[PDB]
Structure formats: structure tokens, C-alpha cells
From a paper:
[name] (also called [name]) belongs to the GABARAP subfamily of Atg8 proteins. Like other Atg8 proteins, [name] is comprised of an N-terminal helical extension preceding four β-sheets in a ubiquitin-like β-grasp fold. This fold forms the LIR docking site (LDS), consisting of hydrophobic pocket 1 (HP1) and hydrophobic pocket 2 (HP2). Once anchored, Atg8 proteins recognize autophagy receptors and adaptors by their canonical LIR motif, a small motif comprising Θ0-X 1-X 2-Γ3, where Θ represents an aromatic residue (W/F/Y), Γ an aliphatic residue (L/V/I) and X any amino acid.
The structure reported here shares the same P21 space group as the published structure, but showed a different monoclinic angle and is not twinned. We collected diffraction data from 13 crystals that diffracted to resolutions within the range 2–3 Å, with the best diffracting crystal, with dimensions of approximately 5 × 50 × 400 µm, diffracting to 1.9 Å resolution. All data sets belonged to space group P21 with similar unit-cell dimensions, and the best diffracting crystal, which we discuss here, had unit-cell dimensions a = 28.4, b = 58.7, c = 69.0 Å and a monoclinic angle of 98.3°. Despite sharing similar unit-cell dimensions, with the b and c axes permuted, the structure that we present does not show a twinned crystal pathology, which is likely to be due to the change in the monoclinic angle. In the new crystal, there is a change in the orientation of Arg28 that allows the formation of a bidentate salt bridge to Glu12 from its +1/2, −z symmetry mate. As Phe117 of [name] forms a dominant crystal contact that blocks LIR peptide binding, this suggests that future co-crystallization studies should remove this residue to enable new crystal forms that permit LIR peptide binding.
Author numbering: 0 to 117
Write the structure that this text describes.
């Protein structure tokens, strides 16, 4: 399974309130939690929390992550939302409305392989 440190560090109600707070303050931005898939052949990420405009695409968000972890261009990266790889052409706003957690955050896992899910 995916075990999210964000959810282990904060109660459901804490996250519900905080997600609602940023969405009220920044209605055109989506709060994203990013964590590495356990065991993956990829470096862990230093920045876990992102507030990204809804107008960037999934491909663009992947680029942001790749750059954060200094992943070489020739080396692949896969994102997973609820165990499926999202389509790169979607906007982060579309992804958020279709996959947001019960707590109002969007949880995106990343890996160097797509053996984890669909």
C-alpha cells in the first residue's frame, strides 16, 4: 500500500480545515501532496507540499517534480493518483476535481517505474 506521512502527521480534520483554507484564499490553485512510492528505484523528494495553479498540465507538474529530484532527462518518471497514472494532458485543476482526497488535498505519488499500479 501507499502510506502517506502527511496523513500520519495530521488528523483528517486538520487536513480538511487546512485544505479548505487555502482553496478559499487561493481559489485558482490546488494543494498537492507529493510522496515517493515505497521501494521505487528513484530518489526521495525534499519538498512534499505544492500549491500549484490549476492551469498547469500534469506533464508540467511532472517537469516540476523531475527538476526537484534532479532526475536525468533519459530517466523516466511516473505519477500515480489513486493507483492509476493520470493522463499528461489534463490540467491539475481537472485532476483535482476528479481525484481529490476526502480531505481536500490531491495526493500524487511518483516512481521510476509503473509496476505499482495501473
Amino acid at each position: 500500500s501507499m502510506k502517506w506521512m502527511f496523513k500520519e502527521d495530521h488528523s483528517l480534520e486538520h487536513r480538511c480545515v487546512e485544505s479548505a483554507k487555502i482553496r478559499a484564499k487561493y481559489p485558482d490553485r490546488v494543494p498537492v501532496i507529493v510522496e515517493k512510492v515505497s521501494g521505487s528505484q528513484i530518489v526521495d523528494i525534499d519538498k512534499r507540499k505544492y500549491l500549484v495553479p490549476s492551469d498547469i498540465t500534469v506533464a508540467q507538474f511532472m517537469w516540476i517534480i523531475r527538476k526537484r529530484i534532479q532526475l536525468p532527462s533519459e530517466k523516466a518518471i511516473f505519477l500515480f493518483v489513486d493507483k492509476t497514472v493520470p493522463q499528461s494532458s489534463l490540467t491539475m485543476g481537472q485532476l483535482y476535481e476528479k481525484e481529490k482526497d476526502e480531505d481536500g488535498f490531491l495526493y500524487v505519488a511518483y516512481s521510476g517505474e509503473n509496476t505499482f499500479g495501473f
